[PDB]
Amino acid sequence: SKIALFDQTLIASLLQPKAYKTKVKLKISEQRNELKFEISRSDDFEFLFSETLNNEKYQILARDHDLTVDFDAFPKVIIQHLLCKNTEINIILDAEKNFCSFIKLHAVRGDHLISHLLKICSSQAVKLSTFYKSADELASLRQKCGDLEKQ
């Protein structure tokens, strides 16, 4: 009930009235009524902005930026823009950090932010499953260094 169309880490310019280039993960997906844009940062856990486009909402966005392209072919076109070297991504935040212009994205809070943070916690958890014998194995090799320092 959610299909990823694009999921990748880009270099974006981040303005907030300071400006700095940062790595931003952009995820474009397709889902049922019941198109979604999600941006997040690996260096900032709380930073999370989204927007969900429906046919009606899209018609306004298509009028504003003079897009003749329909709702089904719009993600296909943006996906191709994201591939081009000449494409720039600029993200400008408001004073209250409630919104950001990428399309106007809103700050993701509550349950969606909880899902995001849990995914980080559980990914950072597999970090302890691989790295647990690290400090212990370092002793056997560091002892081998001093014993080989003589030769």
Q: Is 146 exposed, middle or buried (0-12, 13-18, 19+ CB in 10 A)?
A: exposed
Does position 68 interact with its own copies (CB under 8 A)? The reply is: no
Q: Binding its own copies by CB under 8 A: which of 7, 46, 70, 72?
A: 46
Minimum distance, C-beta of residue 39 to its own copies, in the bound complex (Å): 18
Question: Whose structure tokens read 């790595």?
Answer: 23
Closer to its own copies by CB, 30 or 44: give it.
44
Q: Is 29 exposed, middle or buried (0-12, 13-18, 19+ CB in 10 A)?
A: middle
* Whether 82 contacts 6, CB under 8 Å: yes
Closer to its own copies by CB, 64 or 137: give it.
137
Question: What string marks each residue from 89 to 118 as x (binds its own copies by CB under 8 A) or -?
Answer: --------------------xxx-xx--xx
How many Å apart are CA 112 and CA 46, to the nearest integer? 11
How many Å apart are CA 9 and CA 25, to the nearest integer? 4
Closer to its own copies by CB, 68 or 134: give it.
134
Question: What string marks each residue from 121 to 140 as x (binds its own copies by CB under 8 A) or -?
Answer: xx-xx-xx--x--xxxxx--
How many Å apart are CA 4 and CA 42, to the nearest integer? 19
Minimum distance, C-beta of residue 52 to its own copies, in the bound complex (Å): 21
Question: Whose structure tokens read 């996906």?
Answer: 79
Does position 141 interact with its own copies (CB under 8 A)? The reply is: yes
- Residues at the contact surface with its own copies, assessed by CB under 8 A: 45-46, 109-111, 113-114, 117-118, 120-122, 124-125, 127-128, 131, 134-138, 141
